[PDB]
Amino acid sequence: VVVGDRLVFLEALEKRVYQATQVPYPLVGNLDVTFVMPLGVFKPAADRYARHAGSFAPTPGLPDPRTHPPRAVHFFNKDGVPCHVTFEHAMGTLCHPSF
């Protein structure tokens, strides 16, 4: 093929080599990222505001469970199912003589 102003070969070696043998193809690389999410932070008082007037209104006659400090984080899995993290998953670190 020709790209830019150069004439280059273009070869994929799945059929000639590596076909029908246990060795893996060396061009399937592994990217590696790392994620971070805050668990129980509490925004200052000047930033606790409902965007519109009709909030996620609670059941009438019952206290609003939104105005309280949060104690969990809800994120998404690889498939798409939700998976939550809460304080109880930290006992493995905050229950140890190393503390």
């Binding site: 971070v36 999410m37 805050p38 129980g40 509490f42 930033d47 899995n77 930290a90 670190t93």
Partner: protein, 50 residues
């Protein structure tokens, strides 16, 4: 050994592992929106000598 016992049946790829770094409640939240450094100081090596 200190190794866990082998799990019975695997659903998806090898399961990751999460840590937990203590942090004062009043920490600013906007610190986590962009790409940040969990340590708190963004030191690394690429930007800043010893």
């Amino acid at each position: 050994q200190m190794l866990p016992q082998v799990p019975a049946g695997l659903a998806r790829g090898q399961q990751s592992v999460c840590e937990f770094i203590a942090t004062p409640v009043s920490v600013d939240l906007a610190y986590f929106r962009r790409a940040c450094n969990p340590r708190g100081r963004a030191a690394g090596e690429v930007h800043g000598e010893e």
